[PDB]
Ligand binder design. Sequence first.
Ligand SMILES: [Mg+2]
Ligand SMILES: [Mg+2]
Ligand SMILES: [Mg+2]
Ligand SMILES: [Mg+2]
Ligand SMILES: [Mg+2]
Ligand SMILES: [Mg+2]
Ligand SMILES: [Mg+2]
Ligand SMILES: [Mg+2]
Ligand SMILES: [Mg+2]
Ligand SMILES: [Mg+2]
Ligand SMILES: [Mg+2]
Ligand SMILES: [Mg+2]
Ligand SMILES: [Mg+2]
Ligand SMILES: [Mg+2]
Ligand SMILES: [Mg+2]
Ligand SMILES: [Mg+2]
Ligand SMILES: [Mg+2]
Ligand SMILES: [Mg+2]
Ligand SMILES: [Mg+2]
Ligand SMILES: [Mg+2]
Ligand SMILES: [Mg+2]
Ligand SMILES: [Mg+2]
Ligand SMILES: [Mg+2]
Ligand SMILES: [Mg+2]
Ligand SMILES: [Mg+2]
Lengths: 109, 153, 148, 195, 50, 129
Amino acid sequence: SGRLWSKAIFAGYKRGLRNQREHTALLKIEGVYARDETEFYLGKRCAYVYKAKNNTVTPGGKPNKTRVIWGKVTRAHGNSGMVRAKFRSNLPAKAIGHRIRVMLYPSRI
Amino acid sequence: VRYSLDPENPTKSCKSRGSNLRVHFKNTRETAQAIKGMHIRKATKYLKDVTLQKQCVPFRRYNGGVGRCAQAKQWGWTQGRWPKKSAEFLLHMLKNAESNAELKGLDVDSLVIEHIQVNKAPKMRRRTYRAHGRINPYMSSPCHIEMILTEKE
Amino acid sequence: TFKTVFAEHISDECKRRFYKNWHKSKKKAFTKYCKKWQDEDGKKQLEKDFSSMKKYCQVIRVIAHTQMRLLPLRQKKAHLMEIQVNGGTVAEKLDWARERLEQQVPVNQVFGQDEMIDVIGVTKGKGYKGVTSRWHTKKLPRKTHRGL
Amino acid sequence: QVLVLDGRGHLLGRLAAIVAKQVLLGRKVVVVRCEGINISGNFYRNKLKYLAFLRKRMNTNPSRGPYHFRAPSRIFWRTVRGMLPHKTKRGQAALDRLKVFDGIPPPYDKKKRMVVPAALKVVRLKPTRKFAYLGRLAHEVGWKYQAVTATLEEKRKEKAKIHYRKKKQLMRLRKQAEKNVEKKIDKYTEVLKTH
Amino acid sequence: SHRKFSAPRHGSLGFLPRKRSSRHRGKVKSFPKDDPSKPVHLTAFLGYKA
Amino acid sequence: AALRPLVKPKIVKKRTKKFIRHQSDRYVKIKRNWRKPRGIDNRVRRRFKGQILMPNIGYGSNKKTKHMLPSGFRKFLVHNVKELEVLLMCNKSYCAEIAHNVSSKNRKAIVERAAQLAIRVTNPNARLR
RNA sequence: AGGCGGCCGCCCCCUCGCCCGUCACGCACCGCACGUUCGUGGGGAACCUGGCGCUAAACCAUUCGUAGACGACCUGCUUC
RNA sequence: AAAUGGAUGGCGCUGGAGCGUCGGGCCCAUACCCGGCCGUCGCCGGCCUACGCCGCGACGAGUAGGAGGGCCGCUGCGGUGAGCCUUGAAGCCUAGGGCGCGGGCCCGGGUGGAGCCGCCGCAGGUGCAGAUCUUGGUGGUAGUAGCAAAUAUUCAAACG
Ligand SMILES: [Mg+2]
Ligand SMILES: [Mg+2]
Ligand SMILES: [Mg+2]
Ligand SMILES: [Mg+2]
Ligand SMILES: [Mg+2]
Ligand SMILES: [Mg+2]
Ligand SMILES: [Mg+2]
Ligand SMILES: [Mg+2]
Ligand SMILES: [Mg+2]
Ligand SMILES: [Mg+2]
Ligand SMILES: [Mg+2]
Ligand SMILES: [Mg+2]
Ligand SMILES: [Mg+2]
Ligand SMILES: [Mg+2]
Ligand SMILES: [Mg+2]
Ligand SMILES: [Mg+2]
Ligand SMILES: [Mg+2]
Ligand SMILES: [Mg+2]
Ligand SMILES: [Mg+2]
Ligand SMILES: [Mg+2]
Ligand SMILES: [Mg+2]
Ligand SMILES: [Mg+2]
Ligand SMILES: [Mg+2]
Ligand SMILES: [Mg+2]
Ligand SMILES: [Mg+2]
């Protein structure tokens, strides 16, 4: 029992003032608010948990309604502690202001 | 002949049609949308109330410049009109559907009108006499009427 | 509005005000409410409402109506009006109101002669009229086409 | 989840910037005591700017067009509207997440009010510069509800005074218990492992 | 422009929403203020123009 | 699990939209085939951002993955038995596709000869009793 | 812009309701994710069961004029 | 001091989110470097459709205009496929499968009932979004305007 993943809020895509680049997304991760603080999270792996009414899940025991697009941390972003991430599939753009899990594996503890 | 929206079975269903009959397509569509989804005796009483101007027919789609009435509040609508000739023709075709159900041998007291359909017949052209010796067409708009009735269980 | 307390003896003119079709209505208004006024155990849950009325409210208004039986009218419906008591403290205003529930209020009691009292009502409807009759603008002369 | 912010001694633009940034992330933030939000500059200057803003209105139909609120909560809500992209379905959802209240509501009496340090008058303004109260501005122009709000505010401040004596009595009792004996065995371990 | 004969405007801007009132009994928009010095009385009665 | 041909890599197309024609949505007289606009004011020819993209040489697929079905073969159309038997040498990369005007009486013989010669046919179970 | 908390008289149980120590077990599913949550999460139509209760109101029609272009508004209709 | 109500873009900003001097970071364009793929060009390889097959390197924007290619397309002509079929050709529809960047094409399913296509050469009345384009049909308007110049009709019966 207990949560193992660190909380991170989806913020938006990599973009300029006018245009966007949907291949790389931005994550405001909680606790980190500095360039020196967004160093431990380099190499973490992210997951966006959402719901659909069809019965497509992991083989972990029971069939449910949970669908997850996987991905991982690429690099840091700015001085405020925001973190870039490239997922395996691009974001649905409904996740703005919503939470993406950051799990504590392959990092180097 | 073929009908759109074929029923569940031809045993418990009767059918009727009128072809090339001088009415207005808009009036017959707007009264068919009020007939559709109703018991046959309620529809007969409804059309007799239309001919007696006691219960109206709301114009929901073809509602351009149509005056209001007080009787439309049963339908949740503001406008309304009382089509006498459309009520007469559609009551005649409901009597035809009743006779066809009697020929097929159904429980004639418990029919409901599941499907009704109206579409434009080929119209006949007349002419007006406007200003400056010009001729503008004066054309009708007849329609073909189809109805599929079903027993209620 | 905090809460509204209605009296026990509610007139048929007030019931005709609350209903729309008095012929089609079965005259069933306020039956359980008068039963709550009649029951002794309901009074303990009703006198607490006045004690909360003394504590929290400042503006107390009195709903009264007219007697249509004394009038030569044909309407037979009594018009309800909230009348803000501008007296003293809320406690004696509530005591005055509960003392004069189900009672008549003459005009000679409150209003007097030589008094300057304003009148509020609804104007005479003249119908869907035009501009020179509504806004009283100046007419156009005889030579004007498409309207004077 | 939910955030409850004080409005006493805060600046309008700074607090609106921090609220409009934190409401796009999803944290349901609510600014309470909105009448106490200070605005820098002279008060005649601020009401002259607001009088010009009231003068801004459509000549053809004043209703269909510029709406001008007088309540300070709705002033702050218009300030956050002018900063969020409200014409799209991101800022509209952010404004639906944002709630603003004048005075203090009864759930926000109980729930603890946060104070943002970077939006403070004391942090951002030199104390020899002029300022203006948004509640004073609202009472001067349009918002006729200071006599009710200030009365209920003094009532809940009396409620806070009658709660704080009980809380301080309980704190004195628990520090008398900490002064008492037979707790120090765990306290040696706590001090040697970061009391 | 320069209308050269300025006239007082017809009508009033204050009475401009000339909609039918949803009520026929003319309700009271504002009652006079109260004080504990004055004795207890009522303010508004009903009547019929005869 | 039918024939499982030789080593064919991951097939990419660099875009899969079969580019729409400008203002084909607005007018239903315009078929959705591409046609290069040669106007002097057109945003598509001027290549403004936020518009449709014109087909040019950059969208050309790889020569290894050109004319490649997702199964891993290259299709070749066939009318009869001799045009099926011409694929006897290269059946492990080239599949057959029976023409539409071939009846069932000869279609069953063509698919029987393909099953004997181990030649993949794209539509084996069509137009049968 | 209120529904959870505090006190007293009793209630069927619990002196392991928690930390320190000994002992033996429960799937150890044999390298793999979407796991544990305020969830007896929100809404709609029905299914079988116990107790306590409810027995109407709008719209049309008709009439009305204090009202109306049409709608709309104010009204009447008890067998005395 | 200027007429609609409005403009550092707005919101706001005073220990700055103003002004002038600057330090360290941070963000991106089709710009630059590396890499994958297509094409053009230059050089070149081999006695493997030589009009084919490979290899290296540099570059690809563009109205008027000019060339090359098209195993893009339509119609008909001569060779040609022991071509296709009334166990279903042309045409048409299609939330189907796919190819080619593209012109377009092939197959699946349905109506249809008698002619059709691939390659090589040949010849065109050979490809449409416009021309207040020609012919034909159909919508919004729209059940809208309008059925109002010349005083006026009413009761009963009858055929129906
Ligand atoms: Mg209209
Ligand atoms: Mg009209
Ligand atoms: Mg004429
Ligand atoms: Mg003539
Ligand atoms: Mg009148
Ligand atoms: Mg004239
Ligand atoms: Mg008022
Ligand atoms: Mg130009
Ligand atoms: Mg400004
Ligand atoms: Mg500076
Ligand atoms: Mg070029
Ligand atoms: Mg024939
Ligand atoms: Mg061809
Ligand atoms: Mg030609
Ligand atoms: Mg020719
Ligand atoms: Mg054309
Ligand atoms: Mg053109
Ligand atoms: Mg034309
Ligand atoms: Mg024409
Ligand atoms: Mg013809
Ligand atoms: Mg037309
Ligand atoms: Mg008309
Ligand atoms: Mg005439
Ligand atoms: Mg007769
Ligand atoms: Mg007769």
